[PDB]
Design a binder for this molecule. Structure first.
Ligand SMILES: *[C@@H]1O[C@H](CO)[C@@H](O)[C@H](O)[C@H]1NC(C)=O
Ligand SMILES: *[C@@H]1O[C@H](CO)[C@@H](O)[C@H](O)[C@H]1NC(C)=O
Lengths: 108, 49
C-alpha cells in the first residue's frame, strides 16, 4: 500500500505574490509524480507531469521540484484567474493508483 | 543355481533395518515475498545503467 499527504489543507493570498504547496509520501517513489487542477466545473486538467516538466500550452508562472519523498509546487505570481482544486498523485505499480487529499486557495 | 546343496556353510545376502517415519524442518518466516515490485512494474531502467 502507498499513502500520500498534502499540506496545508487550505490557504489564501492576494495578487502578485508567491504561493507554495507541499506533497509528501511514506516511501521513496523516484520522481513518478504529477499534479492535476480541477476548477469547479467538469474537467480536471493536467498541469505538471513530472518532477519539473510542464505540459505544453500553459504559461510560465508555475514551477516545482522534489525527489525522494519531498515534493514542492509553487506559483511565482498569483493571478485572479486561479481559483480551483489541486492534487498530487503517483505511480510505480502497473495498477496501484491513488490521489492525495486536497488544497484550497482563496483570494485577498 | 542348482537343485542340490552339499554339506557346509554359505553366504547369500545382507539385511538392513527400515525406517518408519518422516520428518521435515524449515524456518518459521511467514512474510509474503515481494516479487510483485519488479515483474509487473511500470517503467524499467536503461541498459547502460
Ligand atoms: C520462530 O523462529 C524463531 C527463530 O529463532 C524462534 O526464536 C521462535 O521460537 C520460533 N517460534 C515462534 C513461534 O516464533
Ligand atoms: C503483476 O500484475 C499482474 C496484473 O494482471 C498480475 O497478474 C501478476 O500476478 C502480478 N505479479 C505478481 C508477481 O504478483
Amino acid at each position: 500500500d502507498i499513502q500520500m499527504t498534502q499540506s496545508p489543507s487550505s490557504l489564501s493570498a492576494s495578487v502578485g505574490d508567491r504561493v507554495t504547496i507541499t506533497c509528501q509520501a511514506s516511501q521513496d517513489i523516484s520522481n513518478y509524480l504529477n499534479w492535476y487542477q480541477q476548477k469547479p466545473g467538469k474537467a480536471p486538467k493536467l498541469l505538471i507531469y513530472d518532477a519539473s516538466n510542464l505540459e505544453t500550452g500553459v504559461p510560465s508562472r508555475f514551477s516545482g521540484s522534489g525527489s525522494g519523498t519531498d515534493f514542492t509546487l509553487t506559483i511565482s505570481s498569483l493571478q485572479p484567474e486561479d481559483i480551483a482544486t489541486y492534487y498530487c498523485q503517483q505511480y510505480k505499480i502497473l495498477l496501484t493508483w491513488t490521489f492525495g487529499q486536497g488544497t484550497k486557495v482563496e483570494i485577498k | 543355481k542348482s537343485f542340490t546343496v552339499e554339506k557346509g556353510i554359505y553366504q547369500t545376502s545382507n539385511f538392513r533395518v527400515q525406517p518408519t517415519e518422516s520428518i521435515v524442518r524449515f524456518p518459521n518466516i511467514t512474510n509474503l515475498c515481494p516479487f510483485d515490485e519488479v515483474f509487473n512494474a511500470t517503467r524499467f531502467a536503461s541498459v547502460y545503467a
